[PDB]
Symmetry: C2
Subunit: 124 residues, 2 copies
């Protein structure tokens, strides 16, 4: 019986650049575990980071920057989030638009991180 996703690994070109984006835009918090590895903490989950040329094993069969397509749920009014994104100088790929969430309908806004990963920020 699987309960939830605990974490996932993003392979990126530059960890510093990735960290700045997730902290400043999404509000995540960067930490260092296993002495020298980086992760981004949010809620009760996390995203571990692997930089190209120094990806820890085992890893995906085809580690690829910009191959992620993730949806994050926000408790912030989605229109306020839209405004926050524009004020941060981030381009809106699409949205706000209605989508199907895991447990119901959500309003989603899409942006991209430094590596091209698609980030869907949504409110139920």
């Amino acid at each position: 019986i699987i309960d939830r996703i605990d974490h996932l690994v993003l392979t990126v070109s530059d960890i510093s650049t990735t960290i700045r984006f997730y902290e400043e835009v999404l509000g995540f918090s960067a930490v260092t575990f296993k002495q020298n590895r980086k992760a981004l903490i949010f809620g009760a989950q996390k995203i571990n980071l692997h930089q190209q040329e120094m990806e820890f094993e085992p890893k995906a069969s085809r580690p690829t920057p910009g191959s992620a397509d993730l949806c994050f749920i926000t408790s912030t009014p989605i229109n306020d989030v839209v405004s926050e994104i524009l004020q941060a100088g981030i381009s809106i790929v699409e949205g706000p638009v209605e989508r199907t969430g895991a447990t119901g309908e959500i309003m989603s806004i899409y942006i991209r991180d430094p590596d091209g990963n698609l980030i869907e920020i949504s409110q139920y």
Copy 2:
């Protein structure tokens, strides 16, 4: 304020092969919605399957995911072996999002790395 991951999209070579793996091994349940869209559900989250908009570089086998199980991890190891699935690594202690976990690693049909763990 971001609360959690709701879902993510996996780009795969064959939806049917992918669904069978996640249903038979991980116990996920496949569903259809809207334009004959397919997804795998578990807990209060889901994984959408693509065989726009999307990732800048949709790539099969590029996922590295960790799922939490409430099933005794050693029983999970046995289930995996009985299913004829190769164990990449584990059981081994690893760092979870909120503490130590015991993890077992396997791969799905596309080569995605799947970490199944218990706190």
